[PDB]
């Protein structure tokens, strides 16, 4: 899994 | 922005 | 699965 | 924008 | 499935 | 706009 | 199926 | 506009 | 089936 | 079935 | 507007 | 099923 | 707007 | 299922 | 906005 | 499941 | 904003 | 699970 909050 | 690869 | 909120 | 690939 | 809200 | 491929 | 609201 | 292919 | 509201 | 109120 | 595909 | 209120 | 795919 | 309130 | 994928 | 309140 | 992946 | 309050 790969998660990003930008 | 919010991104997810699952 | 691939999710994006922009 | 909201995008989903499932 | 592929969903988009723009 | 709202698009769906199912 | 393919749906569009524009 | 509203389009459907079923 | 193919439906359109324009 | 397909229903529309416009 | 109100749309339904059933 | 697909429902929309716009 | 209110959208549902079921 | 996919639901949206916008 | 409120979005759900279930 | 994926939920968003924005 | 409130986001959940479950 | 992945949760965010922003």
Q: How far apart are CA J5 and CA K1, in angstroms?
A: 6
Closest CA to F4 of C1, D2, P2, K6: D2
Is L3 in contact with N1 (CB distance < 8 Å)? Answer: no
Q: Which residues pair with E6 in a beta bridge?
A: none
User: Shortest CB distance from H2 goes to which of I1, I2, I5?
Assistant: I5
Q: Specify the DSSP element, H or E, that contains F3.
A: strand F2-5
**Obtained via which technique?**
X-ray
Q: How far apart are CA B1 and CA D3, in angstroms?
A: 12
Closest residue of chain J to I2, computed from CA coordinates: J2
Resolution number, Å: 1.3
Is B2 in contact with C5 (CB distance < 8 Å)? Answer: yes
Q: Write the DSSP symbol of residue B2.
A: E
User: Shortest CB distance from L2 goes to which of M1, M2, M5?
Assistant: M5
Q: How buried is H3 (Cβ within 10 angstroms: 0-12 exposed, 13-18 middle, 19+ buried)?
A: middle
Q: How far apart are CA R5 and CA J4, in angstroms?
A: 38
Tokens of P2: 């994926």
Q: Write the DSSP symbol of residue N6.
A: -
Collapsing DSSP to helix, strand or coil, P5 comes out as strand
């Amino acid at each position: 899994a790969a998660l990003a909050l930008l």
